[PDB]
Design a protein around this ligand. Sequence first.
Ligand code: A1AEL
Length: 145
Amino acid sequence: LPPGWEKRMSRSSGRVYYFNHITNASQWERPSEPARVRCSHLLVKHSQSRRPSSWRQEKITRTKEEALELINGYIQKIKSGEEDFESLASQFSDCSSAKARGDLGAFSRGQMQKPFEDASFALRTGEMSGPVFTDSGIHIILRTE
Ligand SMILES: *S(=O)(=O)c1cc(C(=O)O)cc(C(=O)NC[C@@H]2CCCC2=O)c1
């Protein structure tokens, strides 16, 4: 299995799935480095974020548990196909990159917070992470290049 993938057992169906412990993504299909990648993200902050404030809300009061529930809802909607990643990043990300549909541009290792960096370089082009935790809050990451 590629970097970070493990074979897991679905609790509800008993069917096997695959989980990546670097990106926190899960998928049913069996999964099949560059100097820089380009990623967008959607950030949900909470009261324990390093800065519990965002361009969108002066005082962020939601709990970390509430932020994870929000993130998990956005992931469901994006995976369902009902909403594009860009649409939810623009509307709900607590990062000013929201106004660029979540795009952070290109970057190399050594620039971003480490769990974000590691998830970004372990994603395939076009792939989306699961919930990724940093000191800023909880991220959904989409690798675009
Ligand atoms: S597993 O069954 O313990 C499991 C763990 C997580 C997680 O902790 O992130 C997520 C999922 C999950 O996404 N289940 C639904 C489907 C499983 C295959 C891919 C899915 O969308 C399961």
